[PDB]
Amino acid sequence: NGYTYEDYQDTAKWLLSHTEQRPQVAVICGSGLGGLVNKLTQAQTFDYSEIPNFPESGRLVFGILNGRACVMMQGRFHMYEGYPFWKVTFPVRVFRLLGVETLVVTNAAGGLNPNFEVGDIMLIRDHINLPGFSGENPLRGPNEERFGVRFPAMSDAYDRDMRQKAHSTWKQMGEQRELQEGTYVMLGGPNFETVAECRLLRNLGADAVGMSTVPEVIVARHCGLRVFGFSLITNKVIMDYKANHEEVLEAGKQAAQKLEQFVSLLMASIPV
Amino acid sequence: NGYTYEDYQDTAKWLLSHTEQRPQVAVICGSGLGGLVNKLTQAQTFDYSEIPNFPESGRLVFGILNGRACVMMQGRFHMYEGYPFWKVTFPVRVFRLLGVETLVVTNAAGGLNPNFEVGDIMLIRDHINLPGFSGENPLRGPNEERFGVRFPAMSDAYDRDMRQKAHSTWKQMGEQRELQEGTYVMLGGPNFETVAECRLLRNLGADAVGMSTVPEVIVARHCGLRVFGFSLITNKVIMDYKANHEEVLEAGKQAAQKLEQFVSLLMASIPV
Amino acid sequence: NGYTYEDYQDTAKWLLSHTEQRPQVAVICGSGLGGLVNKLTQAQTFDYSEIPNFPESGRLVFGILNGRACVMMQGRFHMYEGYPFWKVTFPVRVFRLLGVETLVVTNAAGGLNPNFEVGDIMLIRDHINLPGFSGENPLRGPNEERFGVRFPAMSDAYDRDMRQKAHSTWKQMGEQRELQEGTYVMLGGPNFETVAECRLLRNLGADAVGMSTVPEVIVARHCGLRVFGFSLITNKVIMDYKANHEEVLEAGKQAAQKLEQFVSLLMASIPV
Numbered sequence: 126n127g128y129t130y131e132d133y134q135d136t137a138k139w140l141l142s143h144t145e146q147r148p149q150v151a152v153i154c155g156s157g158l159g160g161l162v163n164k165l166t167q168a169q170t171f172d173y174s175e176i177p178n179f180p181e182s183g184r185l186v187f188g189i190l191n192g193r194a195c196v197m198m199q200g201r202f203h204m205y206e207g208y209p210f211w212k213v214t215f216p217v218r219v220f221r222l223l224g225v226e227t228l229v230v231t232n233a234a235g236g237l238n239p240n241f242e243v244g245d246i247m248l249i250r251d252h253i254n255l256p257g258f259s260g261e262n263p264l265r266g267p268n269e270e271r272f273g274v275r276f277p278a279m280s281d282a283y284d285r286d287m288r289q290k291a292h293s294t295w296k297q298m299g300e301q302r303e304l305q306e307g308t309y310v311m312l313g314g315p316n317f318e319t320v321a322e323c324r325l326l327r328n329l330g331a332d333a334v335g336m337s338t339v340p341e342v343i344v345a346r347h348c349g350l351r352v353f354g355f356s357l358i359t360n361k362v363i364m365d366y367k368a369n370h371e372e373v374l375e376a377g378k379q380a381a382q383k384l385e386q387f388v389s390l391l392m393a394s395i396p397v
Numbered sequence: 398n399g400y401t402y403e404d405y406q407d408t409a410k411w412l413l414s415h416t417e418q419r420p421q422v423a424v425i426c427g428s429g430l431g432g433l434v435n436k437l438t439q440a441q442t443f444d445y446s447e448i449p450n451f452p453e454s455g456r457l458v459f460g461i462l463n464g465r466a467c468v469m470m471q472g473r474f475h476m477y478e479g480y481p482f483w484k485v486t487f488p489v490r491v492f493r494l495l496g497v498e499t500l501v502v503t504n505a506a507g508g509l510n511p512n513f514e515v516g517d518i519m520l521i522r523d524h525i526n527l528p529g530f531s532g533e534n535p536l537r538g539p540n541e542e543r544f545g546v547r548f549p550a551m552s553d554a555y556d557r558d559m560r561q562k563a564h565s566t567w568k569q570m571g572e573q574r575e576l577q578e579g580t581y582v583m584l585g586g587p588n589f590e591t592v593a594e595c596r597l598l599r600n601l602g603a604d605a606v607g608m609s610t611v612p613e614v615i616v617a618r619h620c621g622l623r624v625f626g627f628s629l630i631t632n633k634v635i636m637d638y639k640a641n642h643e644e645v646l647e648a649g650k651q652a653a654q655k656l657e658q659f660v661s662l663l664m665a666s667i668p669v
Numbered sequence: 670n671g672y673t674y675e676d677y678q679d680t681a682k683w684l685l686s687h688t689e690q691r692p693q694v695a696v697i698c699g700s701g702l703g704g705l706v707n708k709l710t711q712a713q714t715f716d717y718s719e720i721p722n723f724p725e726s727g728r729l730v731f732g733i734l735n736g737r738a739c740v741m742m743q744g745r746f747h748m749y750e751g752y753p754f755w756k757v758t759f760p761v762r763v764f765r766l767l768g769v770e771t772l773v774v775t776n777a778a779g780g781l782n783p784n785f786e787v788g789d790i791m792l793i794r795d796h797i798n799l800p801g802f803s804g805e806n807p808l809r810g811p812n813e814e815r816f817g818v819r820f821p822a823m824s825d826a827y828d829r830d831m832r833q834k835a836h837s838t839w840k841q842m843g844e845q846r847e848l849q850e851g852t853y854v855m856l857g858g859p860n861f862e863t864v865a866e867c868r869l870l871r872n873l874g875a876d877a878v879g880m881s882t883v884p885e886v887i888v889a890r891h892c893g894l895r896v897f898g899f900s901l902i903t904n905k906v907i908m909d910y911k912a913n914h915e916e917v918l919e920a921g922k923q924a925a926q927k928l929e930q931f932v933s934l935l936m937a938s939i940p941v
C-alpha cells in the first residue's frame with residue numbers, strides 16, 4: 126500500500142463532488158466486456174486520467190441500470206502490466222468510501238473443465254490464488270483497521286445468496302445452455318500457458334484460468350463488500366500435444382447480448 | 398540481505414555485553430505460545446526495540462530452562478507484515494554469532510490431515526516452501542561464506558535424532574494422545590485459505606498449514622544450526638462447502654500446560 | 670525491464686563493431702557445460718565485464734561450429750543471485766538484435782522421472798514456470814512491440830522440427846542409451862529441495878528440476894527466436910525418507926565428450 130488512508134479519502138471526495146450519482150453497486154468489466162455501460166441511464170463518465178490518484182489503464186461510468194444506481198469500471202488493471210496489487214485494487218477501496226455495498230466482478234477466461242464450451246458463462250463459486258501462495262497479496266503490509274481486519278476469512282468470499290439469485294434469474298431468461306459454476310485460478314501472465322501447466326492447473330481443481338479478479342475480490346472482502354462474479358469462457362484450453370488476444374476479443378462481442386441482459390436482470394435482486 | 402556481515406556482528410556484540418547469559422539453544426515462540434518464557438530462571442529480557450538492528454514486531458528473553466541455557470523469541474516476524482525474508486530471519490544469524498548450536502521453532506497451524514484433532518502437537522518431519530518456488534527466499538542474493546554454502550541441502554533439515562528423542566520424551570510424559578508427525582506447508586497470508594486452496598494443499602502432501610517458520614529453518618540450516626520443531630493444531634480446516642484469530646489465540650492457552658512441560662523436558666536431551 | 674530499447678541497441682552495436690563474426694545460432698552453456706566453446710574455430714572471446722550493459726556472472730565466445738556461425742554464453746545468470754528476470758535475460762534480446770535466429774539452451778538438472786538415470790540427456794519438450802504463476806516474469810511491465818506481442822503463446826515454445834532432427838542425429842551417433850524427453854520445471858533456489866517438495870513436483874508432471882532456462886525461453890519466444898534445449902541429468906532425486914554442487918560439477922565432465930559431439934552435429938541441421 127503506497128497510498129495513505131487520506132489518499133483514498135481525497136479521491137472519494139473528488140468523485141462525490143463531481144457527480145450527483147450515489148452508487149450502491151460497482152461492476153468491474155473485463156476484457157471485451159465493456160459494452161455493458163451502454164445501457165446506463167443518466168450516465169456520467171470520467172476517464173481514469175481525470176481522477177486524482179487513479180492508476181493508468183479506461184474510464185469510470187456512473188448511472189442507473191434497471192433501477193439500481195451503479196458505477197462501472199470500463200477496463201481494469203493487471204499485475205502483468207507491472208503494477209503492484211495495491212495499485213491494481215485501489216478502486217475497490219474508493220468504492221467502499223463512496224458507499225458502495227456490493228461488487229460484481231467479471232472476466233474472460235480459458236476453460237479447464239472438459240465439459241465447458243466456448244460462450245459458456247461460469248459463475249465463480251471459489252478461487253485459487255497462486256500469487257498469494259508466495260506472498261504477493263494486496264493486503265501485504267501494515268493493516269489498516271479503518272478498512273478491515275488483519276486476518277480476513279476468504280472461504281465465504283462469493284456470496285451464496287447472490288449465486289442462487291443468479292441461477293433463478295438465468296432460468297427466467299430461458300437460456301438453452303445451463304449456467305455453469307466453478308473454481309477460478311489466477312496466474313500472473315502475460316504469456317499464455319504451456320500444455321504441462323494447463324494439465325497441472327486442472328489437477329489442482331481449477332475450472333477456468335485467467336490473469337485478474339482474485340486481488341480485487343480479496344480487497345473487497347477485507348473492507349466488507351458483498352461479492353458476486355463470473356467468467357466468460359472464451360476458449361477451451363488444449364490439454365494434449367494456439368491462443369491469441371483477438372480470440373478473446375471476438376468472443377467478447379459474441380456473447381454481448383447475453384451478458385448485458387443477465388447483468389441487467391441481476392440488479393433487480395441484489396438486494397438493496 | 399540488506400544487512401552487512403558487520404551489522405550481525407554489532408548486534409551480537411551488544412547482546413554479549415548486556416547479559417552474562419550464554420545460550421546454547423534458541424527457541425522461537427509462535428502465536429499464543431509465548432508463555433514458555435515464564436519458566437526461565439535467572440531470566441533477562443530485552444524488548445526488540447532496545448536491540449540495535451532488530452526488526453519491529455516483542456522481546457528476547459535469556460535464561461535457564463531445566464538445566465539448559467536458552468534464548469527465546471517472544472513473538473516473531475512475518476512476510477505478510479511487509480518484511481522481506483532477510484529481515485524476518487535476522488535473529489537466526491545473530492543467534493549463531495552468539496554461539497547457539499540448536500534452534501527450536503514452534504507455531505500454530507491449521508490441520509489438513511483428516512486424522513488430526515484440535516490440540517494435537519505435530520512434530521515437523523519435513524516442509525514445503527511455496528514462496529521459495531517463486532524465488533522469494535532468505536538466501537536470495539550474494540552468498541556470505543562466513544555463514545554457509547551457496548547451495549545448501551534441505552532434505553535433512555529436521556534433525557532425526559531430536560525427533561526420536563521427542564517421541565521418547567512424549568512417552569515418559571504419559572500422554573493419552575499420540576504425538577503426531579507431518580509435513581508443514583507455508584504460504585504468505587494474511588488472509589485465510591479458501592476451500593479450493595485447502596483441498597489443493599492437502600493433495601500436495603501437506604499435513605498442516607501456516608504463515609511462518611520455513612524461512613527461519615532455511616537460514617538456520619545454512620549457518621549450521623541443528624533444527625527441531627512442532628506445530629500446535631489449533632483447528633481442523635474445512636474441506637467442503639469460519640477461521641479467525643481469537644480461535645488460534647484461545648487454542649494457545651488451551652494446551653499451554655502441555656507445551657511448556659514438553660519443551661522443558663526436551664532440554665534434558667538435545668544434547669550439549 | 671530496467672533497460673531502454675536503446676540500451677539493447679548500444680550493446681549490439683558494440684559487439685558488431687568488435688568482431689567480424691555474425692552468428693545465426695546462440696547457445697547458452699549451463700553448469701559444467703562450458704567445455705563446448707573449445708571446438709569453435711576462428712573464435713573470439715569477450716569477458717562479460719568488457720561488454721557495455723552486460724550483467725555480472727563469464728564470457729561470450731563467437732566462432733564457427735561444424736560449419737555454422739555461433740555465439741555461446743560460457744556461464745549464465747540466475748534468479749537466486751538476486752537478479753530480476755529482465756537482467757537474467759538481457760543477452761537473449763541482444764542476440765536477436767545481432768541477427769541470431771535460433772537459441773539452444775542447456776542445463777544440469779535433477780531427475781524426477783523414475784526411469785531416468787545419471788548421465789541421461791533429456792530433450793526438453795515442455796516446461797512448468799513456477800515463478801511465473803506468481804507474476805515473476807521477464808515480460809512483466811510495459812510491452813515493447815519492437816520485440817514482440819503483449820500476450821505471447823508458450824505452448825509451442827520448443828520447436829518440433831528440431832526435436833525430431835535431434836532424435837535422428839542421436840541415432841546416427843549410435844548411442845546405446847536412448848535420448849530421453851520430458852518436462853522441465855524451474856524453481857528459484859538456491860537451496861536444494863526437500864523430499865516432500867520432490868514428491869510434489871513429480872505429481873505436477875515434471876520429469877526434471879532446475880533453477881534456470883525457463884526465463885530465457887520465454888524471452889526468446891517473445892522476440893521470435895526458434896528454441897531447442899536439453900538437460901543433463903546429473904543425479905536421481907530421492908523420493909523417500911544428499912545433493913551438492915560438486916556432484917553436478919563432476920557429472921558435467923563425465924558426459925563432456927557426449928554433449929560436445931551431439932551439439933556439434935545438430936548444427937548441421939538447424940537449419941539455416
Ligand SMILES: Nc1nc2c(ncn2[C@@H]2O[C@H](CO)[C@H]3O[C@H](P(=O)(O)O)O[C@H]32)c(=O)[nH]1
Nearest residue numbers: 155156232233234235334335336337370820
Ligand atoms: N491465463 C489465461 N488467460 C486467458 C485464457 N483464455 C482467456 N484468457 C484471457 O486472455 C486475456 C489476455 O488475452 C486475459 O485477461 C482477461 P481479463 O482477466 O482482463 O478479463 O482474461 C484473460 C487462458 O487460457 N489463460
Ligand SMILES: Nc1nc2c(ncn2[C@@H]2O[C@H](CO)[C@H]3O[C@H](P(=O)(O)O)O[C@H]32)c(=O)[nH]1
Nearest residue numbers: 276427428504505506507606607608609642
Ligand atoms: N495459513 C493458515 N494459518 C493458520 C490456520 N490455522 C491456524 N493458523 C495460524 O493462524 C495465524 C493467524 O491468525 C497464523 O500465524 C501463526 P504463527 O505462524 O505466527 O505461529 O500460525 C497461523 C490456517 O488454517 N491457515
Ligand SMILES: Nc1nc2c(ncn2[C@@H]2O[C@H](CO)[C@H]3O[C@H](P(=O)(O)O)O[C@H]32)c(=O)[nH]1
Nearest residue numbers: 548699700776777778779878879880881914
Ligand atoms: N533445483 C535443483 N537443481 C538441481 C538438481 N540437480 C541438479 N541441479 C542443478 O544444480 C545446480 C546448483 O548446484 C543448479 O543450477 C544448474 P544450471 O540451471 O545453471 O544449469 O542446474 C541446477 C536438483 O535436484 N534440484
Ligand SMILES: [Mg+2]
Nearest residue numbers: 174176178179
Ligand atoms: Mg492520474
Ligand SMILES: [Mg+2]
Nearest residue numbers: 446448450451
Ligand atoms: Mg530498532
Ligand SMILES: [Mg+2]
Nearest residue numbers: 718720722723
Ligand atoms: Mg559492466
Ligand SMILES: [Zn+2]
Nearest residue numbers: 139142143144
Ligand atoms: Zn472539478
Ligand SMILES: [Zn+2]
Nearest residue numbers: 411414415416
Ligand atoms: Zn548499554
Ligand SMILES: [Zn+2]
Nearest residue numbers: 683686687688
Ligand atoms: Zn573497442
